[PDB]
């Protein structure tokens, strides 16, 4: 129901502050470290670079995040690595590369098997934020290879996706149809055909309905991804906290069986506006 709302947030920019401090707010249940945005056929070992935070150029290694990731996990926060995003050059390449990449993610990010870009860690999941890939092929293969690895090692990591609000999604439909993502974070912004607008929840309510009908299984596996300020969604979609709680959520079909919570585009915007703080106050 509404009271059990789980809040997720994207973190990865200088203005977001420290990961440790983000977790310590206790406002979030899931944090997406964002983004591994450069991979493809000839990139056997993808490197992680967070703008103004870590990587070759900020002269601070991303492996320094290891202890903060573990602190977050110890306090009950799930930390995911998000693939893709708004920028970069990313492609799943081919069926063979999909296996190579799935293995890479498992060995270096999901099992503490080897030292990777974020140190020796075992993240809670992998998030497919495939917004602007080179093309739509092989994302389903990547998901399937990670899913197979999960079975082989009887692992507990989660798999999630962030499609746009217009179904079927241009890039992730084939992957979503496998029914193998644990969570689907629908981006209800930057698309006038399926986002909220002042005094009109019909398009967003209808889009939510389209998603409940096309995503199986019928578990609590759907989240609404929303911008935390008007500035983070130039194409529209921002929903004031009071409107979300009082005018939108109560009117989403199958909220009681399908709704898991909300994801907020981005930590910086949330910090500036107090979005999650106000939502929490009203839950």
Distance CA 167, CA 184 (A): 12
Q: Which CATH superfamily is domain 1-283 in?
A: Glycosidases (3.20.20.80)
Taking each helix axis from N to C terminus, what angle separates 139-152 and 95-109, rounded to the nearest 10 degrees? 50
Cβ proximity of 184 and 160 under 8 Å: yes
Among all chains, which residue has been given the structure tokens 């507990």? Answer: 156
Burial 198-231 (b: 16+ CB within 10 A, else e): eeebebbeebbeebbeebeeeebbbbbbbbbbee
Structure tokens of 282? 């009203």
Tell me how far apart the terminal alpha carbons of the chain are, to the nearest angstrom: 10
Nearest Cα to Cα of residue 253 among 225, 213, 282: 213
The answer to whether residues 80 and 124 touch, using CB atoms and an 8 Å cutoff, is yes
In whole angstroms, give the CA distance from residue 227 to residue 267.
10
- Do the Cβ atoms of 47 and 55 come closer than 8 Å? yes
Q: Say how far apart CA 215 and CA 278 lie, in whole Å.
A: 30
Q: CA separation (Å) from 58 to 20, 53, 55, 62, 81?
A: 19, 6, 6, 10, 20
Experimental method: X-ray
CA distance 253 to 259: 9
Show the CA angle centred on residue 149, arms to residues 165 and 128, nearest 5°: 20
φ, ψ at 240 (rounded to 5°): -60, 145
H or E segment and range at residue 68: helix 66-74
Query: How far is the C-alpha of 82 from the C-alpha of 104, rounded, in Å?
Result: 14
Enter the resolution in angstroms: 1.6
Find, among 185, 182, 122, 176, the residue nearest to 158 by Cα: 182
Residue 53 sits at φ, ψ, to 5 deg, of -120, -55
CA distance 83 to 175: 14
Taking a C-beta distance cutoff of 8 angstroms, is the pair 13, 25 a contact?
no
């Amino acid at each position: 129901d509404i009271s059990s709302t789980e809040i997720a947030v994207y973190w990865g920019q200088r203005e977001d502050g420290l990961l440790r401090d983000t977790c310590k707010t206790n406002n979030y249940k899931i944090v997406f470290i964002s983004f591994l945005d450069k991979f493809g056929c000839e990139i056997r070992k993808p490197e992680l670079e967070l703008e103004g935070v870590c990587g070759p150029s900020v002269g601070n290694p991303c492996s320094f995040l290891e202890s903060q990731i573990k602190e977050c996990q110890r306090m009950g926060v799930k930390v995911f690595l998000a693939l893709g995003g708004p920028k970069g050059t990313y492609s799943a390449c081919s069926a063979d590369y999909a296996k190579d990449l799935a293995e890479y993610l498992h060995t270096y990010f999901l099992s503490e098997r080897r030292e990777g870009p974020l140190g020796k860690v075992a993240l809670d999941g992998i998030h497919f934020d495939i917004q602007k890939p080179v093309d739509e092929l092989n994302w389903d293969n990547l998901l399937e290879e990670l899913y197979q690895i999960k079975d082989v090692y009887q692992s507990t990591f989660l798999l999630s996706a962030a499609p746009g609000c217009l179904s079927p999604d241009e890039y992730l439909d084939n992957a979503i149809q496998t029914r193998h993502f644990d969570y689907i974070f629908v981006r209800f912004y930057n698309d006038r055909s399926c986002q909220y607008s002042t005094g009109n929840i019909q398009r967003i309510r209808n889009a939510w309905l389209s998603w409940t009908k096309s995503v199986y299984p019928r578990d609590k596996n759907l989240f609404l991804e929303l911008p935390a300020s008007q500035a983070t969604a130039p194409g529209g979609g921002y929903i004031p906290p009071s409107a979300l709680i009082g005018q939108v959520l109560p009117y989403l079909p199958d909220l009681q069986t399908r709704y898991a919570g909300i994801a907020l585009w981005n930590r910086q915007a949330d910090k500036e506006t107090g979005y999650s703080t106000n939502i929490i106050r009203y839950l």
